[PDB]
Amino acid sequence: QLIRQLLERDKTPLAILFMAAVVGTLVGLAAVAFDKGVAWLQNQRMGALVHTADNYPLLLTVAFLCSAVLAMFGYFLVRKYAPEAGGSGIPEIEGALEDQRPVRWWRVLPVKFFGGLGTLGGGMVLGREGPTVQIGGNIGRMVLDIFRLKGDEARHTLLATGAAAGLAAAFNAPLAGILFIIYEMRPQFRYTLISIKAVFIGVIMSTIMYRIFNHEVALIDVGKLSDAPLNTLWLYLILGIIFGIFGPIFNKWVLGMQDLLHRVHGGNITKWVLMGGAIGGLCGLLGFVAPATSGGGFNLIPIATAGNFSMGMLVFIFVARVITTLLCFSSGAPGGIFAPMLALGTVLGTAFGMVAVELFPQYHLEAGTFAIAGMGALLAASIRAPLTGIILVLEMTDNYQLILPMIITGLGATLLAQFTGGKPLYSAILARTLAKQEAEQL
Amino acid sequence: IRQLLERDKTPLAILFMAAVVGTLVGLAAVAFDKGVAWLQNQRMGALVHTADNYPLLLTVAFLCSAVLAMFGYFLVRKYAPEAGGSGIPEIEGALEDQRPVRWWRVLPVKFFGGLGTLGGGMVLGREGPTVQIGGNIGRMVLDIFRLKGDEARHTLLATGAAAGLAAAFNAPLAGILFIIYEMRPQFRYTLISIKAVFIGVIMSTIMYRIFNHEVALIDVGKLSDAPLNTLWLYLILGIIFGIFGPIFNKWVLGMQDLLHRVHGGNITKWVLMGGAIGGLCGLLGFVAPATSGGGFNLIPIATAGNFSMGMLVFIFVARVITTLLCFSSGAPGGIFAPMLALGTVLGTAFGMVAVELFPQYHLEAGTFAIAGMGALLAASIRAPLTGIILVLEMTDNYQLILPMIITGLGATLLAQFTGGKPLYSAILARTLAKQEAEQL
């Protein structure tokens, strides 16, 4: 026939495109088994809090010793077995695509899936996209060892497939794992057009294989809000300057708290997992006396957008939240920072709307329509990926009408986070740990 | 207090004048969207003396669409021969410093010649004459204002190619994703040139939503959902578009030389094969208004179950024929929009087969018309991430964001397997090959 000898004349891209369909199945399993392990521990922690609900001094202790032993175990697997399994994964699947950081598929996966569950099920303010990309990247290398595929354009197209299979299966946004790994993250490499179709395959087969088990489950349920009038759109630029100034100060604070939480222990392992037990048990203690300033962050985004918080409470879920967010990502725990910054951005958003209601009453603006244009304005001024933050809150909130103010608060964030000495958060951590690798080598 | 502004004297001038290309395109993309709509109603206003004498008075739909046809085939073939086609080849070829930009010649013939032979009833889109009008205003503000450099005429030109693409679709994301990333995807834009495309797109969608307010250009509404047990049906639709990718690409690069033989470059014979294509699709604008038409007139009709299967092999056979005649001749009109209303006809022709072959799926026929809309665009132009968000901004169906990647994948993968270049880099490669042959 004709298709017989034609489908084998190249045989190199047809194998690495089928290998991107066995990665997205494997990461899509590892994104829904990691999700059903973090939704079970939170359904077992609160099932033990309300069981023996008699003595209130016993309530705070059992909310502490049930999150300390998940933090004393979550920090234990990281800084003993696989020390690159700390923090997010995006600083470690950026140098690994740049051929600077090695990928240990046999070591990150038994740590990021198990020890990354205790620092997520323990009530800490960490994202479930960090421990899904770094599992996904360390799965896209696993299929090049069990199948023994070789090459320099074959290791970089499956390491970016699983890195896109971890972001498009932890947020259920198949246009935010494609728009991040290809274009916005590493804005100097291009992924010539056989390496994008292996990102497209590993996102399709990692959202289909994610929506099979995690079906009829809402992750963001803000509803359908109003629209942004054209005499209101200049108030989204001042929201950009607020986020664009707070961006590089928050970007310096996480890199500044890594000089304090690394200087309290000195380097010892027994001083480190007990520091995690006193910082991952506090966020399991704060999740019972004030549940807004804890958790993964996806609990208050349909709440703060509804405007049920007052202005006196909206500072409390920003002052006692950015202190708590800096104490779980910059403290060396396995966990991302998008879902913290997707809730740290929606608090400052709706705190700008309730100011704009009383200050400008003639505009008739909704107090929560800045909380949809506030989520994708803090990770566009710290990570500096503005087109991801627009097409991450579109697949979650499903609000098409705020497509023009999302760029006004997206441009205004990323313009002041470059003028005022800014730096990308997911490109200044990798450039910082590479200096320590150049220090212990010499 | 003082160093923060004088150090940013020059690099901020491409961030303030990027709001001038944004503003002046939004005032020239709504004087274009109204001029293409004012000239349409004057044709239908003169067709009220036709229903009594339909054989003899049929020429009113034919001659009045041919006088306006020879006003766009004459301003282009005499005053500015680089404003023919779709413009985006002559903008991409000018973003690499290979093609010259004549803003003193393109703008008086892409807005005047691009209004007659786009508002006369052609089968062209209104973003080809909006990107190149946008990609000349970004050169208009650079010659009349005292600024220069190597990254200044590649940023104001690259925020003009995005201010026109975002003010011709009401899509503030399909103009950003095309120019920076999807068009020529081996070039890296500077971080001050990406955030100057953002100011051009924002202040052009603002100057478009002020005039054309509370009106959606695609009114499909909210369609049904796509279950996970029928998602392979949006892949065989991609394979059918993937073979039709380099076949429609070979036809439009074949009929450009096939139509070139009938006049041979003589100016008085261009407009006779240019007036007989405007007069044909003006007569087709009264006999069967789904055969002709510049795109969006038949997209809300041929999606929510109106046309039968016996008619959708006529709005695809006789529409491809009048698409390869209106754009491959040399009219001032883009092809980015008449591939939306051509992949949604074959897309809904695949939807009315799957509902007949698979009764167990409970599939609406219309959910294959949104996936097929950004499929032929992702097969012949091969920008598979603009054509997903472009249909997302207009048709507003966020439920079908997973099938639009699958039909987006299969249309850009099988087109790469059989062998096919992007369309806006293949017409440019023929023009740059014709440039070296004309001087020798």
Automatic annotation (TrEMBL), chain B:
GO terms for cellular component: plasma membrane
Residues flagged as site, Mediates proton transfer from the outer aqueous phase to the interior of the protein: 127
Matching SUPFAM superfamilies: Clc chloride channel
InterPro entries with a match to the protein in the record: Cl-channel_ClcA (IPR023861), Cl-channel_core (IPR014743), ClC (IPR001807)
GO molecular function, one term: antiporter activity
Compartments, as annotated in UniProt: Cell inner membrane; Cell membrane
Site keyed Mediates proton transfer from the protein to the inner aqueous phase: positions: 182
Membrane disposition: Multi-pass membrane protein
Positions with a binding annotation for chloride: 86, 335-336, 424
Transmembrane residue ranges: 12-32, 53-76, 156-180, 192-211, 231-249, 270-287, 307-327, 334-355, 367-392, 399-418
Catalytic reactions on record: 2 chloride(in) + H(+)(out) = 2 chloride(out) + H(+)(in)
CDD domains reported in the protein's UniProt record: EriC
Signal peptide: none
Keywords noted in UniProt: Antiport, Cell inner membrane, Cell membrane, Chloride, Ion transport, Membrane, Transmembrane, Transmembrane helix, Transport
Function summary: Proton-coupled chloride transporter. Functions as antiport system and exchanges two chloride ions for 1 proton. Probably acts as an electrical shunt for an outwardly-directed proton pump that is linked to amino acid decarboxylation, as part of the extreme acid resistance (XAR) response.
Subunit structure of this chain's protein: Homodimer.
Family membership noted in the UniProt record: Belongs to the chloride channel (TC 2.A.49) family. ClcA subfamily.
This protein's name: H(+)/Cl(-) exchange transporter ClcA
Organism of derivation: Escherichia coli
